[PDB]
């Protein structure tokens, strides 16, 4: 069967909580786990020397002080930069504001003292290997990224790199996914034991034609709305459940990262949310007594 139909309700920190902390940094992950997130959610790219690093965009421009495409830079180049240079609470990463906007700019580079409990390295772009070292016992939702939407070779390069590494850990508490369905198929071929979730065309095909997503799928990981169509409804999740799949919902501009939304998606029987505000979600769950993995409680439907 599917263990993930019981792993609910999940607080899956979107890149660690991009509205509450520098996205894809160890600070964000360490913070997010500490306040009660059941699962990390993160993005992977690869350096010029084929090192899997945890970053979302193909270019380091938006979240750091540097410039260039991750695949053009070595890990040693990428690691020295400040992955909190442009963080602003409530607004992820936004360059060009008064330097006082940035409460954690410069901590990686040593110009400000880190908050208590963290080192300057907790604010750089981490190797995926270092995140796995740091969370041996936390499930990690990993998403394969590429150089551009149409650069199918870069997704496949990353899928290869990812499966090799995840195999070496011998772990199984992952969910690997990509917007590019080819990457998922290639990843599933190289690492059949690791749970996946469908890419874009598999989701369309399931929603539209009933076609079950690739063997090995544990969950459907869906935005709330897409191009006007409401995806994460009670009915859609009723059917996904009936067909044996979990539903994890993300937001990221398709619907507001706010309290009413999180509540509606909880009420829609989703099994996990991917909030940019993992603190805000954790408070809602605690306050409502919603069942959690292990810790039982209220079933909101
Ligand atoms: C008629 C057919 C209708 C059927 C529905 C079709 C819907 C299809 C839309 C695409 C859905 C693919 C889901 C699989 C990939 C995934 O998990 O999404 C990425 C998400 O976590 C973050 O979103 P971002 O773009 O990575 O942005 C954040 C960046 N950050 C973290 C720094 C803010």
CA-based end-to-end distance of the chain:
22
What six digits make up the tokens of 98? 């008064």
Please choose, from the candidates 68, 19, 61, 93, the residue with its C-alpha nearest in 3D space to the C-alpha of residue 251: 19
What is the CA 287 to chain-centroid distance, rounded?
24
In this structure, the number of other CB atoms found within 10 A of the CB of residue 72 comes to: 13
Give, using CA atoms, the residue closest to atom 31 of ligand 1.
15
Strand-pairing partners, residue 52, are 46
> Does 162 sit in the ligand 1 pocket, CB within 6 Å?
no
Whether residue 72 is annotated as binding a ligand: the answer is: no
Atom of ligand 1 nearest to the CA of 226: 7
> Does 134 sit in the ligand 1 pocket, CB within 6 Å?
no
| CATH class, range 3-288 | alpha beta
SS3 labels along 236-259: HHHHHHHCCCEEEEECCCCCCCCH
In this structure, the number of other CB atoms found within 10 A of the CB of residue 220 comes to: 27
Listed resolution, Å: 2.7
CA torsion sign for 174, 180, 184, 189 is negative
Please choose, from the candidates 4, 3, 36, the residue with its C-alpha nearest in 3D space to the C-alpha of residue 17: 36
> Does 208 sit in the ligand 1 pocket, CB within 6 Å?
yes
Q: Which residues are catalytically annotated?
A: 14, 56
What is the rounded distance in angstroms from the CA atom of residue 168 to the CA atom of residue 191?
Answer: 10
Instruction: Give Cβ neighbours of residue 298 (< 8 Å, ≥ 6 apart).
Output: 288, 289, 290, 291
What does each C-alpha distance from 144 to 20, 30, 183 come to in angstroms?
A: 23, 22, 7
Are 18 and 92 in contact by the 8 Å Cβ rule? The answer is yes
What does each C-alpha distance from 206 to 142, 201, 209 come to in angstroms?
A: 21, 8, 6
Q: What residue segments make up the domains of the chain, in order of their start?
A: 3-288
> Does 207 sit in the ligand 1 pocket, CB within 6 Å?
yes
Residue 252 CA to ligand 1 center (angstroms) comes to 8
Atom of ligand 1 nearest to the CA of 231: 5
Whether residue 100 is annotated as binding a ligand: the answer is: no
What does each C-alpha distance from 235 to 3, 173, 227, 232 come to in angstroms?
A: 22, 28, 19, 8
Q: Where are the beta strands (DSSP E) in 90-139?
A: none
Whether residue 43 is annotated as binding a ligand: the answer is: yes
Instruction: Give Cβ neighbours of residue 212 (< 8 Å, ≥ 6 apart).
Output: 206, 243
Residue 115 CA to ligand 1 center (angstroms) comes to 32
Experimental method: X-ray
**What residue has token string 């006007």?**
228
Strand-pairing partners, residue 93, are 87
In this structure, the number of other CB atoms found within 10 A of the CB of residue 67 comes to: 10
Rounded to 5 degrees, φ, ψ at 115 are -55, 155
Exposed, middle or buried, 106 (CB in 10 Å: 0-12/13-18/19+)? middle
**Cis-peptide, bond into residue 9, ω within 30° of zero:** yes
What does each C-alpha distance from 176 to 72, 194, 196, 240 come to in angstroms?
A: 24, 7, 5, 19
Instruction: Give Cβ neighbours of residue 149 (< 8 Å, ≥ 6 apart).
Output: 179
């Amino acid at each position: 069967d599917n263990p993930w139909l019981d792993a609910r309700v999940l607080n899956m920190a979107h890149a660690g909580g991009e509205n509450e902390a520098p996205a894809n940094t160890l600070y964000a992950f360490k913070r997010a786990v500490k306040l009660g997130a059941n699962m990390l959610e993160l993005d992977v790219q690869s350096t010029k020397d084929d090192q899997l690093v945890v970053i979302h965009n193909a270019t380091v421009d938006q979240t750091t002080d540097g410039t260039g495409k991750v695949r053009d830079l070595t890990f040693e180049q990428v690691h020295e930069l400040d992955a909190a240079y442009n963080f602003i609470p409530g607004r992820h990463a936004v360059p060009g504001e008064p330097p006082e906007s940035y409460p954690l700019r410069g901590v990686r580079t040593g110009e400000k003292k880190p908050p208590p409990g963290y080192q300057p390295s907790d604010f750089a772009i981490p190797k995926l290997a270092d995140v796995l070292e740091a969370f041996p016992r936390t499930p990690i939702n990993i998403e394969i990224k590429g150089t551009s939407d149409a650069d199918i070779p870069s997704f496949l390069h990353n899928a290869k790199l990812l499966a090799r590494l995840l195999k070496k850990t011998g772990r199984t508490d992952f969910i690997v996914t990509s917007l590019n369905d080819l990457a998922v198929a290639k990843f599933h071929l190289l690492a059949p034991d690791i749970p996946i979730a469908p890419g874009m065309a598999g989701l369309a095909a399931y929603f539209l034609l009933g076609v079950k997503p690739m063997h090995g799928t544990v969950a459907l990981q869906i935005p709330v709305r897409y191009q006007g169509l409401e995806i994460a409804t009670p009915e859609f999740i009723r059917r996904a459940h009936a067909d044996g799949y979990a539903v994890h919902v993300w937001f990221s501009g398709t619907a507001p990262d706010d309290e009413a939304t999180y509540n509606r998606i909880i009420d829609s029987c989703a099994d996990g949310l991917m909030p940019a505000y993992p603190a805000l979600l954790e408070r809602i769950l605690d306050e409502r007594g919603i069942e959690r993995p292990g810790r039982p409680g209220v079933d909101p439907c």
